[PDB]
Amino acid sequence: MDDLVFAGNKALYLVLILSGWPTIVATIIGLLVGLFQTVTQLQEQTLPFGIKLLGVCLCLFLLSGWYGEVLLSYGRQVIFLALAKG
Amino acid sequence: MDDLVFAGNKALYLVLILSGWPTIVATIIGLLVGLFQTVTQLQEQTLPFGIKLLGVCLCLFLLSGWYGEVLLSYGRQVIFLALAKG
Amino acid sequence: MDDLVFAGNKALYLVLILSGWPTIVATIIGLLVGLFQTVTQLQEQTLPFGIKLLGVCLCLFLLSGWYGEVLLSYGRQVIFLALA
Amino acid sequence: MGNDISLIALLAFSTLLPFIIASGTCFVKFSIVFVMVRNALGLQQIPSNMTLNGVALLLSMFVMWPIMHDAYVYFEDEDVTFNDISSLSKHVDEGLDGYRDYLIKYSDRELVQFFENAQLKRQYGEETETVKRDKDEIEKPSIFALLPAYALSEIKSAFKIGFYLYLPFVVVDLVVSSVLLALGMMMMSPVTISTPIKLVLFVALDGWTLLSKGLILQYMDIA
Amino acid sequence: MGNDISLIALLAFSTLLPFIIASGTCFVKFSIVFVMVRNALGLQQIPSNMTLNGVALLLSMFVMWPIMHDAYVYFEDEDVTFNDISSLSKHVDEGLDGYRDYLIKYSDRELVQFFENAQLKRQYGEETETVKRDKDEIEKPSIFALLPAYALSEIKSAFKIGFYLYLPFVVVDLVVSSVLLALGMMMMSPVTISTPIKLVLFVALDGWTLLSKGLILQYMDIA
Amino acid sequence: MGNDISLIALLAFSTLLPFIIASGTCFVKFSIVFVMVRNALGLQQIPSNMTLNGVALLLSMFVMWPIMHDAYVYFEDEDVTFNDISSLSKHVDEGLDGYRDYLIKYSDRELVQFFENAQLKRQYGEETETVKRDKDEIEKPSIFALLPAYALSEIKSAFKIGFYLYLPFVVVDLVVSSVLLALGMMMMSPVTISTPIKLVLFVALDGWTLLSKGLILQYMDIA
Amino acid sequence: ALSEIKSAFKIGFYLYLPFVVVDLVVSSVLLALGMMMMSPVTISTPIKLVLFVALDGWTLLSKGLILQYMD
Amino acid sequence: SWPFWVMHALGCIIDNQRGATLSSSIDPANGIDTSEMANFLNMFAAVVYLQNGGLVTMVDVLNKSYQLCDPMNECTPSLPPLLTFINQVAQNALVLASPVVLVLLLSEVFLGLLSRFAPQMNAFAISLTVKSGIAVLIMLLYFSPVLPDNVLRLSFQATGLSSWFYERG
Ligand SMILES: CCCCCCCCCCCC[N+](C)(C)[O-]
Ligand SMILES: CCCCCCCCCCCC[N+](C)(C)[O-]
Ligand SMILES: CCCCCCCCCCCC[N+](C)(C)[O-]
């Protein structure tokens, strides 16, 4: 059922790319702040969380318009397929 | 009777088979990343999540087909066992 | 839908600000006590937890008047945008 | 009564009233908004649904009463008696226009026309139009076409209002959870603390007053 | 027995009775308060709603009885028979003053007045202005205005109480976490220890007696 | 045939029966204690709410069924005679004393007296209370005064009991956590270990049996 | 009456087993990702619907239920 | 009911040990919380009970209840055994579930001891990936006795009516 196959595969691909960007940013920031604590040999729990929050908020301010474009496109498309037979 | 026991056993057997591969790869990725973080001392904790999300989604793409063939064959079998008595 | 877009952007801005200060105070206290452990060195895990609690509590005790005014202003603004 | 059929029609309408109220009146909106408020505050049981619905019905009464009264005063006049079918039919038709106006003010015409063309079997139910030509369609449209459009048009509006009402509380939730992470108290569920903050925030805004007033003002205007 | 229409009125009233109790009586406040206390202690199933509402209904009965008795005695009185519509209607109206005067102490003036402004017949220009003397305006606003203003103000005042009830438990919940962190047992969930403390505090405070007394004292006067 | 009013009283009573049981009977206590202990063991839905409510219901009947049966045996008594509404009222009231005594035993005198005042004193122009010497009123508090005063005391007793049952489980949680730390086997959540231990320990000591006996022995002798 | 209740329950049992599988699988993959806070029912409901539609359940079932009463 | 409540408890214990705290199953008729495993085993026990003909024993014990104790003699349930009942129901479930709990405990402490050599390893997050597979694997071996271990050893039988009830008139 090429229609069910398409809609089902695209749902998962969209989950993977919508979620990837915030987690990539968070991971890279995490690594750099973890390193800096080693070369400084200076340690605390809170600095990485503090920076990660800002990094993710900026990520959302920037990309969020595109999240809307992608979701609207998919939303229309699935309805048209569901009611396509008539 | 034995049909009941057989069908109930098979249900657990199928759960085991289908769920087994994702949980294996999520284990192996967890061990490798945990070791790597001791081999080079880095105290990140989202990196496992970031990698294992991609790992699990990839094998869901790969096995998407066999999943549907197994469940169809099972459903037909149990509908026969339920209704075809004479 | 300029109004809807604005309301949305402002929400995140508010979260980023209102959470910002307490994390900064906790950061600075944790860092300063950390460095102070490197001299005259004795190494203890809990001192950051003990002292940062006082930091954050005192920060909230001072600023909590501000928070309510910002929140109120936002709530009125959105209620009006919606019912207009 | 002076006519047995007039009597029958009156009783039938009286029997259908609750479905008309539930499907062609601002009650549709007010009913939904209060339940969304309760959800956004995060309360399961309280206030009771019949408390909220009671208030919603009282408020809707003010908005709708002027039309009911106008129609009653119009129909109770025995000042003319009717020569023929068409004379009666037109006399009745012209009485509903006070209601027909109110539905046409708030529905969205593209649906109304779509349904009109659909209950007629015309041109196999849907066909293209080369030319776009508007024919005082406001007076043509049947009530049986207007009613669904109004319903959908107003449900959507309710969802919009509920969206706006959620945002302030979402802010509170994320803020509490972040300051708890700053303290490192990672095990503790925010819902134990965030709820009272929401309560006092709503009490200080006096959300019930603002909300109720604004709802009415969308339909009426008052000094 | 009596006037056939008076009989109809009595039966209609008795049919609507539970919605009135649920929307224009102190039952609204007590129902909310008890459930909020259960949530503050953090219990999901204890006591049952069927127990809490039973208590709330009994407590409300004391507060409301004297008004029902006074109105009953006022109508079970053979004193007069009536000449005219205006005499009868003003005799009826003078019987409800006890209830009207109960609602007036607790609804809020500005919201009441806004609703009274809402009922007046529409005008094409904005309505002709007026100011009216106290014997109508202070003493005698209409009940179809008072009733929803009452419901809304009651809900608000209930949330306010719930807010204060939460504060001491929030204090407990924080302190206990900070002490567990001071002992280093960072991984243990503090709910397992905070809950019994909360219960101990509430029984030593004897919160049920205080709540049940003070809530009644807000309406009764006892010496 | 019988009497048509006693028929109404029978049918009415049988509709209210479950709310009386739910609000003025030891069921109130039994159903609470079990659910509290279940939460303290930290594993909801074992035993089922069906099991718990079923047992609590059965036990309540041993306490209450003799009192109802005694009342019906009092009324089915062919030797009485009456002369007036007063003489009948007295005899019907006398029939309920068997229940009245139970409520008086298990409830607070001063809260009862408070509600006994509150039913009246909105009527009263005076402060003196001595005006009836106690011996009548101390025996005859009204049942509507007794009911909520009983329920509010039962709940408090339930919490008192459950408090003392929480303590040992808390201790067990502290012990487990301290052992994991002393072993340095840090990164394991203790709940996974301690919930099996709590369960096995309580079942191996038959906590539910001792609990059931300890509850019934407030109300009966089993022998 | 009790015989028909017995056999109807028996038939109804068999039909659960595929959906039971679906539910336990979904729950396991979510725990494998650590998303402990996700309610599975949201994800598992559409998978059940599409499974039943692919089987064409109502055809098979209404056929067999009638063939049990006539040769 | 007694044979079914034990299998329901068993399923709840398993689904709690493997995590799964936010289970999906639905049941409004009885008003009891339910999980996927609990619902499954509760159904399975019912079909094997019916297939062994237990439906005859249900009406048998109904008829015997009237012959052995009569409405007019004020028949009454015995108190002493009722005071034991809840604890017997709990005990049978724990005795039956015990084999899966121990193996799930040992599997977790084994990862804890392993973590000593690699302290950045999140042994908890690893155990969440493993335990649902281990739980099904082990339950699949000891599955077949679940037929007889309920059909007889837990089913109530009419001879028991002598002790749980007496006539008080
Ligand atoms: C995003 C997670 C949930 C996605 C569920 C998609 C269901 C697809 C069902 C069909 C799968 C079998 N297939 C591809 C052969 O059709
Ligand atoms: C504080 C978190 C709030 C998250 C939800 C915010 C509202 C949804 C975003 C609305 C705007 C969408 N956009 C950017 C496409 O216009
Ligand atoms: C967080 C994801 C949970 C997914 C659980 C269901 C797995 C099966 C998904 C349908 C089959 C694979 N595919 C690619 C078509 O989606």
Ligand SMILES: CCCCCCCCCCCC[N+](C)(C)[O-]
């Ligand atoms: C959660 C179990 C795994 C996902 C697959 C569930 C079955 C979906 C329906 C399969 C349909 C197969 N197909 C397209 C050949 O018909």
Ligand SMILES: CCCCCCCCCCCC[N+](C)(C)[O-]
């Ligand atoms: C910590 C907040 C998590 C929010 C998750 C959803 C993010 C995408 C949608 C909201 C976008 C808001 N924005 C950037 C338009 O303002």
Ligand SMILES: CCCCCCCCCCCC[N+](C)(C)[O-]
């Ligand atoms: C994050 C912890 C502190 C949150 C404080 C937020 C207070 C919101 C309620 C403001 C009420 C202002 N008011 C009425 C007291 O003046």
Ligand SMILES: CCCCCCCCCCCC[N+](C)(C)[O-]
């Ligand atoms: C179980 C409720 C229905 C039957 C009524 C039972 C009434 C209580 C009888 C208790 C007798 C106890 N005993 C023998 C020690 O007196």
